[PDB]
Amino acid sequence: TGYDLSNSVFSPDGRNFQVEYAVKAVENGTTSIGIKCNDGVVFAVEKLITSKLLVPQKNVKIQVVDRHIGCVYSGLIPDGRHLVNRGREEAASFKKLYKTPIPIPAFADRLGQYVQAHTLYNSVRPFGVSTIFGGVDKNGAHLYMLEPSGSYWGYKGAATGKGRQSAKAELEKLVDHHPEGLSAREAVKQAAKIIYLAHEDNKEKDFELEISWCSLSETNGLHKFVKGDLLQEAIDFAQKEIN
Amino acid sequence: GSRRYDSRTTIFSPEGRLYQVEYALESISHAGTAIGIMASDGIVLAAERKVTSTLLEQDTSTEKLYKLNDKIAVAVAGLTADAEILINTARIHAQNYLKTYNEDIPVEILVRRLSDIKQGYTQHGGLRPFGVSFIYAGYDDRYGYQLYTSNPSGNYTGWKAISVGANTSAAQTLLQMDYKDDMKVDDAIELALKTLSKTTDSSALTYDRLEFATIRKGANDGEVYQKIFKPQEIKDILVKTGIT
Amino acid sequence: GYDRHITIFSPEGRLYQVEYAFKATNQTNINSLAVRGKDCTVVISQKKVPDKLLDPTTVSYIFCISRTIGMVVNGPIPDARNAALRAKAEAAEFRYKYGYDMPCDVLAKRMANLSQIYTQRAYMRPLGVILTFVSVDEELGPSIYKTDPAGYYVGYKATATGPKQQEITTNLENHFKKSKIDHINEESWEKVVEFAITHMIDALGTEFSKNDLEVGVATKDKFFTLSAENIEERLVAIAEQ
Amino acid sequence: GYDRALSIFSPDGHIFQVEYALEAVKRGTCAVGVKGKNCVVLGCERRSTLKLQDTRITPSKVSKIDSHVVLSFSGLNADSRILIEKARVEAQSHRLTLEDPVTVEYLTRYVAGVQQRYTQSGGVR
Amino acid sequence: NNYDGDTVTFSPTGRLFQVEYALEAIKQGSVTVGLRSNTHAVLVALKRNADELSSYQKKIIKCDEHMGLSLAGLAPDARVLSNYLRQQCNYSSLVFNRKLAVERAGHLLCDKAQKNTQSYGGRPYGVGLLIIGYDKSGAHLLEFQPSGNVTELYGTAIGARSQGAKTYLERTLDTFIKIDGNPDELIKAGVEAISQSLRDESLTVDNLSIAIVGKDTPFTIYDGEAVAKYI
Amino acid sequence: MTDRYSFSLTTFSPSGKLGQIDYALTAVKQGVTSLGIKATNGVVIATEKKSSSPLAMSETLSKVSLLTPDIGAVYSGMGPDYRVLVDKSRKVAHTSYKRIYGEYPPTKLLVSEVAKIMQEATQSGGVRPFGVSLLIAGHDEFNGFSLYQVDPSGSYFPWKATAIGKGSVAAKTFLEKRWNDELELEDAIHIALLTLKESVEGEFNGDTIELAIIGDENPDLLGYTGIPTDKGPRFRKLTSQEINDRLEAL
Amino acid sequence: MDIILGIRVQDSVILASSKAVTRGISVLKDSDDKTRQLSPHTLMSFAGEAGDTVQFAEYIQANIQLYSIREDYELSPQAVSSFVRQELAKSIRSRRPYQVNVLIGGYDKKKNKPELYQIDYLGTKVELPYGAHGYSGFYTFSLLDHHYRPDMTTEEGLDLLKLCVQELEKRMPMDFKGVIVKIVDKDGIRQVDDF
Amino acid sequence: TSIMAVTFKDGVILGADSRTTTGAYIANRVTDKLTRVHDKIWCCRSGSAADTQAIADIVQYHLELYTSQYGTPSTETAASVFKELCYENKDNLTAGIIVAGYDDKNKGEVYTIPLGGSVHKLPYAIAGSGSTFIYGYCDKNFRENMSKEETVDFIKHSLSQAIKWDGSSGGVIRMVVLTAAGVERLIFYPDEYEQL
Amino acid sequence: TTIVGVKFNNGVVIAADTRSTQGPIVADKNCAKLHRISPKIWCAGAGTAADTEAVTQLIGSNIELHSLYTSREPRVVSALQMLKQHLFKYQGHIGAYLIVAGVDPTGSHLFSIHAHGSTDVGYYLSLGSGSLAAMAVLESHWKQDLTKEEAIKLASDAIQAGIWNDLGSGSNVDVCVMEIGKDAEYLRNYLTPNVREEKQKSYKFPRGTTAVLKESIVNICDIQEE
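C-alpha cells for the assembled complex are given below, as produced in the milestone run.
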C-alpha cells in the first residue's frame, strides 16, 4: 500500500513508520549514556572492538564543539559524523557575527534545522542517529538528547542504544544518591559501572572504556577526555563493584 | 520494474501515439461545434456555446471568439485553461513582429510559434500539452486569406472549411457538395448555418447561445474589417434564413 | 488508493493527510485551555508529568514568538520548532519594515498561507501540528486564534487542543453564556489564573499540581511566564477557599 | 517522478522510446527518393482524401534548407516544426562562421545530432 | 520488499540493503592485503584481466608522494573519489602548507558518499579503499567502506576469501608491530597473507602489485622484476 | 479512480476530463451556500457563515472580501484557500494595473488575472489547484454592474442570478422564476433572504448571515475630499442591525 | 570617410559604395566591397567604425534570409529598415554602443515602385530620393536638390554622379579611388564596372 | 553634533546633542540621536544620520531574534553585530557608532566603534563634530566610579564647553540613567549649562 | 516650492502650493504637490517631482495592500519606515524631500525624509526652496497647543510670506486639513495672489492670416462597413 511505500507521509496511527525504523537503527549499536551534574556534564559511551587490529585513541567518535561543547552519538556512523560536521559550521556562524559562544539551549536548534527538515522533505533521508551533547555556558550546565524524529529534550541523565532500558533504570538510582548531583570525579566512577553492566548483550566482542566530561572544577569550563590516572581509577573502582 | 509513464509524457505509448493526446481529443468533442469557411471575400466563423438556460448573460461574454488583430482571428474550442495561455502569448508574438518589423504577422509564422509551445510540453518536461483546438482566420497581402487548424498534437494544416466537436466527418461532407468558388459572404452564412443545425443535437440554436462572426472584404477601400455580431443581430439572421 | 494515501486529491473531496495530521495531535495526550480575559490573556495547557525531561521546574510547551506574543502547540514537537522559528523571523522583519507589533490576525494569516504552500509541494509534507497564536493588542484587546492542520483560523472565546477538548469546550460553553460576555470581567490577572484552573479540573476530571500545569500569562506591553512558585501560589489560594 | 525512476533500458538493448517512435513513421505517410546522376528526385505522399484542403496555404512537407540542399521527412508534421527550423538556423550559421556553402555531410550530422542529444538527455524525448 | 530500490526509506532491519549489495562488489573484486608499522606501510593488491592477452590494470592510484591507496570494487565509484582526495591533498599543501591528515580525509569521503546515498537518487559509492599515508604522526591505514565507516587498523584484507588473510594478520599482529624500518620484512609479510586468500591462482610478478611508502622510503610502485626478489 | 494517470494531476485522465477538476467540484458542492444578484440599482449578495463551535467569534470570519474598494466578492469553500488568491489578486491589481494605468482595473480585467493565477496551478504538476468557487461583483462607469463566477477549471463567466455551494441546486430554480431583470435592488434583497431559507433554515439572524451590497459612490467611505474626479467606494457593508431590519420587514 | 552615396531615379535605384579602405594613415587596399546583398531586390551598404559595421550586416542578412525561407517570401524593403532600426536601437542602449549607418533601397514587386531609405549611425529610418554619409554628403545635398528631378532617368543619374564625385575629390583632399555603382531595378541587381 | 558616554558606579549615562546642522542652517534641533534597539542596551549615533539610523535599525531586529531564540543580550554581544555590518560597508557606508549598554552582572560597558568598526573596552567615548574640544577637559576631571549626581554634572559641564564654543554641536542635552532601577530620561534647558 | 505643516490637538494641517518651475522659466502654474499614501495620511513632496510621484505610486500600491491585509489603520511610523527603506533600496541615488504627516489609532505624529534617507521628528517643519523663508516667519508665532482656526491662519501667513519672497513658490496654494475622527479636507485654490489683467490691445488675429500649403482629412474611427 501507499502507507509504507514512500516516507515523509502521515500514518493512520499518528506515528510515521520511519520513526519506528529509525529507533531500531539507534537501538542497534553500542550503548551511549550521559550524566548532567551541578558542576558540569559527563558523557559515557561504549566503544566496540571488532578485533585486536584496531588502534586505540583513533576511532573515538566523541567530537568537541569549540572547547565548551562535547558531542557523542549512537547510530549510523556516517550519519553521526555528518551531523557533527554541520554543527561545526553552524556554531561558527554564531560566533562569527555575534562574537560570543553559542548557548546550549539554542544550540539544539541549529542541529534541529537539519534533522527536522529532512523528516519533512522526501528528497533527503532523515538522520538515523541520536546525538547527546552538552557542556557549560554562562547560563549554566545543560544536557540535551536529540531524537532521529527531530524532537529533543533536556535530561539530567539519558540512555540510548541497545542497553538504554537497563541503563535508564540505573541513572534514576544516581538521583537518590545526591539531590544536587554527583561530583565531577564521583560521576565518572558511577558512569563506568553503568557501562560495565551494559556489556551483557555486548559481551560477544571486546569493548573499550570511553568517557569524556566538561565541568567548571578541574577544566574551568573546558571539555577534555579522561586520561592519566583518572582513567585507571574508574576502571579498578567499578571492577570491584560488579564482583 | 515498470515505474514509468506515470509522470513524464516523453515516454511513448504502445501504439506510438501518446495516449494523453487521445484523451485530449475527447475533450474537444465535449465542447461546442465551430465551423470555419475560407472564401475569397472573407472568412465565416460560427459556433454554439456550452452554457445554457436564461441565467448566464450571453450578449457580452464570448469565450469562442477572440481578436488577435484587425485581420487574424481565432476560434477557441476546447479547454479554457490551456487556451488562455496562448491567447496572451499570441498577442505578444503578434505585436513583437509589429514592433520590430512594423507589419502584420502572417498566420503561417504565428501558428508555428504557437505550435512549438504545445510541442515543447511533449518534448521537454512532463508539462501538460494543450488539448484546445484553435481555428486561425487571417488575411495576408501575399497568400490572401489563410485558414488553418491547431491540433493538440502540435501541428497545423490548411483548410478551406474545417469543423470541430461532434460530427466532424459529417460536417465536412455537407460542406463539400455545397462548396463554390464564386461563393459570396451571404452564401457562406446560410450554408454554414444549416450544416451546424444538422451536425448538432440542438436544432434550436437561438441568438444568444450561438456566436456568429464574419470577416468581410466589402468594407471601405477593400480593407479587412472584423465585425463582431451581437446576439441581437444574430436573431435577424435566423429570420432571413427562415429557420426560426 | 495510492493518491488517497498521499497529498494528491481523493474522490472523497477532502485530503486524508489533513485528517491524519489531526490524529497525531491526540497521540501526545496534551490538553490545553486558553481563555480571553479583559485586559490580559491566560493560557494553561496540561503538563505531562516530567521525570528526566528538560528542567524539573519548568517543561515548556509554550513557545514565546516575540514580545507580548505567546504560542501553544499541540502535536509532534519536531514540527513545532520549525513553525516557531518561522514565526519569529516574520515578526522581526515586520517590526523593522512597518515599525509596529505583529497583529494577531496576520500572524495566523501568514502561517495559514505557509500550510497551503507545503501541501502544493510533493517533496515536503505540511505541518501536522495545531498552532495557537495568543497575544493582547492595545486597541483590539486580548485575542486568541488557533490554526488547525487544514489552516483555518478564527477567534475563540475558549479554545482547547487534545482528545478531551470536547469536554473542555462544553464545560466552558456555559461559563461565558452565564456571564453573557465574551471575556472575563476580572481586571486583575491574579483571579483569572485561579478561575481557569478551577474549570480545567472539572472539565478533565482530575486535579493537578505545580509540576502538572504550565500557566502562560499574556499582558499589555510586557509578557512573562509564571514560575513554579507563582503557579503553586495560585493552587494554595484555591485550596484555602 | 515522485519516487519513480526515469531511466529506461529493457533487456533487448532497445529502449521502448525508439521502438514506438518508428511505428509513427510506419503508420504515417510514405516517403521515397532516388538519387540520379545529374539530379535528385524526392517523392512525398500527402492525403487529399479529406474534404476541402488547400495546398498553396498548406506548408509543403518537402522543406528547402539551402539552395542546393533540401529536406523531406515522413511522419507527424508536429515534430517537423522544430527539427527543420534547427537545420535552417545552422544552414545560415555554416555559411557565416565558415564562409562555406552548407556541407551535406556536416548538416546531416547536425540534424541527426538533435535527436542524438535528446536520447542521452533525461526528461526529454 | 521495496526498500531495496529506495534509498530514502528506512528498512525494517534499520539499514538499507543497497549497502549490503554494494559490499558484494568488494568480495567479487580484486583481493588486496596490506599492513603498516610505525615507519613504513605496505599494500599488496592483485591485478586481474579479462583475457590472456589483456594487460593487468593497476589497482593502486597515487594521489600524493607520501600518500597512496588501493581500490577493490566498482570502477566508477573509485577514480571519482580519487580526484576528490587529489584536490584535498593539494588544497592542504597549498592553503595550509601541510600534508592532509588521514582522519580529515576520511571524514570528507564520508560526507561526499553519504550526500549521494541519503539524497534522492544520486550516485552511491560502493567501492572499498585502503588508504595509507605518512605524516608527523607516522604511518596510518584507514579502511574505507561503502557503508560510511572509516577505521584505522594496522592492516586488514578485503575481497574474496578475506577470512584467510585476516586470520594470519591477527595472530601475527604482535610480530608485525615490533618490526619497523625494514622494507624486506614488511613486504614479505604481505606475500604470505595473500597466498592464503588466493585459491587456484598462481602468484606471479604481473599479477601482484606491491607498493611501500614511509619516512625513509617514499611511495614506489614495484612491478615486473622489482617484486621478483620479495616473492 | 486513483490510476497511473492520476499520480501527476497535470496528466490527462481516461475519463476525458482532468481528475483535479472533478476532485475540486466535490468540495464546492459540500461548502457553504453563497450567491449573488445583479440588479439595476445595485448588486446584492447573500451567504451563510460556516457552522463552528459556539465559542468562536462570528465577526472574525468574513465571507465577503474586497479586492478593490468598488468590487466585492463572496466565496464558498475553504477559508485559507480563498485568502491565497486574494493576496495575489490584490497584488497584481496594484502592480500590473494601478501602477501603469494610474487607476484600479475594472471587474473584467481583475477577474481575468484571478482565473489566470488558478490556471498556473492547474498546469503545474506539483502545485495543485484550489477547490474553491469565486463570485466577484463590481461596479464601474464603463461596463456597469457585473457578476462573474470562477470555476475550478480556471475560467470565468458572468451570471445575472446564480448560487454556489450546497444550496446552489435549489437556488437555481428559485432565483430564475422569482427574480428577473425588471426588479429593483430592494426587491432583490428580500429574494436573497428567502433564497438561503430554501436550502436550510436554522437561525436567520444577522449573526451567522453576512450580507453585502454594492451601491453608488459613498463620500463618507472615501476618507477625504480631494479632487472631484476621485469618488468614494461603491461598496457598502450591512451591519448586524441593518440585516435584522430587512428580516422583520420581509 | 568611407563614402557611400545613393539616389533613387525613376525606373531604378542607384547606389554607390566606396572602394579604397584606409586603415589609419596608409591605404591598405584600393578595392573593397562596402555593401552586402540581402535579397535580389534589395541592396544595403554599411559604413562606420572599422569592424563593427562589417560584422553588423552579416547576422542581419542571415536573419532576413532565414525569415524569408520560413515564409517562402522575400522580405519587403520597407520592413527591412524597421528590423535594422530595432537592432540599432538596442545597440546604443547596450554596454557597447554601435554606430552603423545603412542605405536600404530596392524595387518593391508588390507596388511596382522603387524605394530608398537613408539611416545614419543613430539608427533613424528616413526615406529620401538621395542620400550620403560622412563629410562628403554635405557637398552633395544642395547640389542634387537643385538639379535632380523625379523624372530623371537612370542614364542621366550616372553622368550626374560623375560630376558629384569629381567635385568631392577636387574640393576635399581625400581620395576613395572611385566608387562601386550597382543598379537595383525590376531585373535585379546590376553591377556597373565603368566607375 | 557631539556624543559622549561616561560610566558611573551603578551604570553608564548616555548623552547626545540633538541639533542636526546642514551647512549653515539647522534643520531640526530636537532630532533624536539615540536609537533604542533594546531596553537596557542602547547605541549612540553621530555623523550622517541616514547611515546611523540604517545600521541601528538593521541590528534592532537582530536582537529581537536573539532574545527569543538565544537569550537576553549583553553589551559585548550586541556591540559585535554593528562591527560586522560596518566591515563590509566601510566604503559604502561611513558612520560613527558608540554602543554602551547595561547588564545585571558586569553593570555598564562602553565600546567604541570607529568608521571601519572595532570593539574596544573604554571607560568613556568621545566622538562627533563638537567633541574636538572635550578631549583634554574630560580626562582631567574623570574619576573611577563617579557618583550618579556627579556624573550628570560632569557630562553637563563637558558638553557645555563643546556647545558654547562650537556651533555645530548644541541643543537640549538629553541624559539617561541605565541601571538596575530602570530607565530615566533627563532634559536640560540650554541656560542651565550656559551659565556654568 | 514652499511646504510646511502645523500640528494641533485634533489633528495636523499642511500647506503646499501649485507652482512647479523647471529652470528660469515657469513650467506649470497648477501642479499638485500633495501625494496620496492612505486616505488618513497625506504627504507633500519636493525636489524632483518625477521621482517623488514614482515613489508615491510605489508605496501607494504597497501600504494599501498591507492596510487591506490587516483590515486596520497602519501606523504613521509605518509610512516613515517604508519610505526610508525605499531610499535604501535605491542606494540613496534618488534625492527625496517629503513630509510624513497623518493619524493612526495611536495618535497624530509628524516626520520627514531627506535625500540620503535620514528621518527627523518635530512639531513644525518646512520643505522646498522656501523652507528657510517659511520657517523664519513662524518663529515669532510659536505657541503651545494651538487651535484649529489658528493652525490654518498661521500656516497661510508663512506660505503667503514665501510667495512674495521665493519666486519658485506662489500662484495657487492647496491646504489639506486632517482632523482626528474626520475626513481630510482638501482646499483647492485657497490663496490666489495672482490677478489676471485684461489686454489693452486686441491680439486676436482674424481667419486667413496664416498661410496654409495643403489640407487633408483623416478619420480616427473604424472604416465603414459599406
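The domain at 1-231 of chain E is CATH 3.60.20.10 (Glutamine Phosphoribosylpyrophosphate, subunit 1, domain 1). Chain E is about 35% helix and 25% strand. Further analysis is deferred to the final report.
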